[PDB]
Design a protein around this ligand. Structure first.
Ligand code: 1BF
Ligand code: ZN
Ligand code: ZN
Ligand code: ZN
Length: 393
């Protein structure tokens, strides 16, 4: 209700996401939960694991109700699986309400929990369509809004191992967390937080692709993804351009693949040879867009290893995708991002936790007017499995 209580309620480690405290059950069990706008389950570690000291103990919650239904959730990189139920859930540093939500108690997992990350569970903030095992499992935020008078919106300020902070404001927008204008791009379809990129520039220069290539096969806003991820053709045009701009430096191929650090003497990194990247997002008005401009300090991420303490070393945090553009924590860290589910749009403003550069600034600017936007959306080939399923909503 007053966002002073919700400011600074996220923590994390670099490249391991941002988590918020939540309490589950009665009496309350406090757990650190990853904020993930890329998925739609609330799932908590619920059995011992080498990388957890803490986990949800269903047997200690007088309010736990078992749903007697399993759930299995494969990723390209690993998996989690568990038993569905419901429990009382509150956010200690969030709105002053308690709700009964679905919770998947993770009983087995592979490559999901990481050594040292400090979270024990994930909060999928995206829409029911992508929930597992299907869209009848109501996601947490849908329950929150239905059961309380919490407005149907939340906003994220992600402030860039190494430790990180920021804010998730639930039910509102806190004006102390951004400067300048807030620009909105429509949510194209409520499954992921899917948006439409209409133009891409690297140091002022247009990539000049068919704009559907930018959104092939979707573009999404995803706090659960580290990198900016780009479709193959786009990723290759982008690497070409950033290489061109930085050609005073001849890096190994591993670097461009994210597989190798590149270093300079401490304090000497030539930031000026690395270009800014502007993504122009479809505006709320037909024929308008606005751009979000990313500094090299967002996509070249420092990594401290043992054998080069007097060097600053960096990993390239743009990577190739085969499942569309993903605007991950790398993009989000520049910005205050408003998930306005009520008005089916996403807002971007320059964050009050700025990443600065010597001479340039991360920016949100518009309008830019065209001959449409454009149509730059891609229509994913409709499978027979998708076609057949009935959605009685
Ligand atoms: C949302 C989440 C946790 C989903 C996920 C499931 C699995 Cl099994 C592995 C990695 C990830 C994963 N990967 C991120 C990296 C990341 C951001 S927060 C925690 C992670 C992570 C990396 N490995 N396991 C979690 C990515 O690919 O960019 N993100
Ligand atoms: Zn607390
Ligand atoms: Zn039917
Ligand atoms: Zn359905």
């Amino acid at each position: 209700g007053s966002f002073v209580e919700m400011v600074d309620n996220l923590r994390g480690k670099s490249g391991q996401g941002y988590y918020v405290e939540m309490t589950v059950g009665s009496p309350p069990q406090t757990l650190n939960i990853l904020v993930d706008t890329g998925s739609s389950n609330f799932a908590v570690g619920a059995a011992p694991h080498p990388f957890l000291h803490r986990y949800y103990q269903r047997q200690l919650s007088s309010t736990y109700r078992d749903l007697r239904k399993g759930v299995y959730v494969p990723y390209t990189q690993g998996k989690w699986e568990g038993e569905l139920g419901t429990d009382l859930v509150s956010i200690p540093h969030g709105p002053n309400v308690t709700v009964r939500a679905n919770i998947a108690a993770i009983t087995e997992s592979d490559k999901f929990f990481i050594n040292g990350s400090n979270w024990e569970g994930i909060l999928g903030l995206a829409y029911a369509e992508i929930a597992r095992p299907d869209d009848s499992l109501e996601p947490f935020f849908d329950s929150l809004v239905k059961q309380t008078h919490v407005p149907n919106l939340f906003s994220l300020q992600l402030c860039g191992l190494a430790s990180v902070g920021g804010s998730m404001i639930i039910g509102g927008i806190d004006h102390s967390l951004y400067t300048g204008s807030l620009w909105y791009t429509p949510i194209r379809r409520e499954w992921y937080y899917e948006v439409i990129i209409v133009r891409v520039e690297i140091n002022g220069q247009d990539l000049k692709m068919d704009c559907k290539e930018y959104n092939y096969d979707k573009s999404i806003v995803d706090s659960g993804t580290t990198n900016l991820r780009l479709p193959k053709k786009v990723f290759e045009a982008a690497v070409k351009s950033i290489k061109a701009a930085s050609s005073t430096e001849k890096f190994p191929d591993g670097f461009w693949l994210g597989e190798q650090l590149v270093c300079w003497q401490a304090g000497t990194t030539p930031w000026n040879i690395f270009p800014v990247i502007s993504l122009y997002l479809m505006g709320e008005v037909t024929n308008q867009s606005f751009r979000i401009t990313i500094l090299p300090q967002q996509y070249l991420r420092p990594v401290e290893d043992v054998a080069t303490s007097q060097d600053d070393c960096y990993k390239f945090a743009i990577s190739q995708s085969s499942t569309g553009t993903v605007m991950g924590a790398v993009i989000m860290e520049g910005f205050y991002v408003v998930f306005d589910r009520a008005r089916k749009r996403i807002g971007f403003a320059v964050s009050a936790c700025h990443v600065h550069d010597e001479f340039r600034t991360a920016a949100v600017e518009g309008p830019f007017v065209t001959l449409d936007m454009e149509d730059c959306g891609y229509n994913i080939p409709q499978t027979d499995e998708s076609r057949s399923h009935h959605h009685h909503h």
